[PDB]
C-alpha cells in the first residue's frame, strides 16, 4: 500500500503498545504483529497489525536487526513520528 506518516503520543510511564517481529538478520522488515488495546499505538489510530515500520523520528529501520530496532524504538519519547506501510 502507500507509505504513510503517522503521529503517536506516548506518555513517559508507557511503552509504545506494539509487538514487533522481523529484522534484517531474518530477511524481513520490522513488522507490527500486535497492537495492545488502549496503549499509545492503539490510541493514535493510524498504526495497524501488518504494518512495516520503515522509520521512526527520521531514523531508518529498513535495514535494522531486530534488537537494534527495539533499542531505537524504545528510546523515542513524547510525540513520535512513524513512517509505515501495509503490504
Amino acid at each position: 500500500g502507500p507509505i504513510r506518516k503517522v503521529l503517536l503520543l506516548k506518555e513517559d510511564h508507557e511503552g509504545l503498545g506494539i509487538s514487533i517481529t522481523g529484522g534484517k538478520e531474518h530477511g524481513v522488515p520490522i513488522l507490527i504483529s500486535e497492537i495492545h488495546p488502549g496503549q499509545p499505538a492503539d490510541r493514535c489510530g493510524g498504526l495497524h497489525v501488518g504494518d512495516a515500520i520503515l522509520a521512526v523520528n527520521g531514523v531508518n529501520l529498513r535495514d535494522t536487526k531486530h534488537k537494534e530496532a527495539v533499542t531505537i524504538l524504545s528510546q523515542q519519547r513524547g510525540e513520535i513520528e512513524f513512517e509505515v506501510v501495509y503490504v
Binding site: 509504545l16 514487533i20 522481523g22 504483529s33
Partner: peptide, 10 residues
C-alpha cells in the same frame, strides 16, 4: 515474512 524471527513487546 519469517516465522523464525523473534517477537518483542515494546
Amino acid at each position: 515474512a519469517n516465522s523464525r524471527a523473534p517477537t518483542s513487546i515494546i
